[PDB]
Amino acid sequence: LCFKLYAKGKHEKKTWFESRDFCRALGGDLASINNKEEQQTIWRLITASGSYHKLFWLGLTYGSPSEGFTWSDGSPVSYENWAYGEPNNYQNVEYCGELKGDPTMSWNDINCEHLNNWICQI
Template sequence: MKMWTVLLLVCAMTTLTYGAAVPEVELVGEEGGPSIQEAAPEEEPDEMAGGFVPASTALNSTSAHRSVYPTNLKEDLDEMAGGLFIQEAALEEESDEMPDGPSIHESNRLMSRGFPFCPSGWSRHNGRCFIYISSPMTWAQAERHCQDLGGNLASVHSHVEYVFVQNMISRITQGFQFAWIGGSDAVEEGTWFWSDGTPFTFAHWDAGQPDNQANSDCMLMNFGDAKKFDDQPCDFEKPFVCAMNM
């Protein structure tokens, strides 16, 4: 009897709490032992009284949130990755449109770390950077200036390279101006070397040169009608060409 009373109280509390009808209760006699069988409602009401949400609905809603969240996260990550790809492509395109490159000091730092481009104002050819300096200097002053820029007076190792340097000068000066380059035989007359230490294997002397006139121990380019090498006194002041490795 006490058990039935407790069960009836539970049903009453459930009705008051959830605002739903009291389910049918089937009582079983003592032979089968007391039990309660709740009859499930045939269909759910359209509106939940008192704001009650069935457990199955809540679970379904939670599952939906759990399934949507990873999908949204993946979409956000994909969108971020796409944005980064677009930014990277834009930076690459911008760098292609900047042939002058960074400053000389920044370029020297980057080139020492393996970045293959030339500083602003320099021209690239065959793994080296070249620049024409229009301020006249003696050969020794020009060599020191090139060293301050990270290179030496230019060495020339082929006819193709010589034509490249000529064309660089021509674009700047609208002509084939005289210019010091890195050849010298000041150490031993008749034995020419490049100031950057590379082998002297290319000779492009003008006719009758070198003649060592007035102790001419330093190399000038664009000499004579043929615009070739000439030896000149090293204390003459001329424009010059610097070169440095990339």
């Protein structure tokens, strides 16, 4: 799959659901990061665009209480890169996952209604 970054204007950021709908409208989905190679590919896209110090939606969304986090594309949640202390369901309202687009490429759970940049796979 081909990853593409979407880091548009300050008033063009989207909720997790809006971002998923955007990627699905293209025939793809929000990006799943399934191994270190895919993580590197996305980091290099960040460096190439100069889109530094931004937060991006990934396809991380909570499933049932039993399952915990899932990928919207159905990929197994095997590789994980949560920041230390995450996921933490801070204030009990965090059911989607974002990428911190810095060299750590770490993940954080955050409120799904937050307006973020996003990454599609197509």
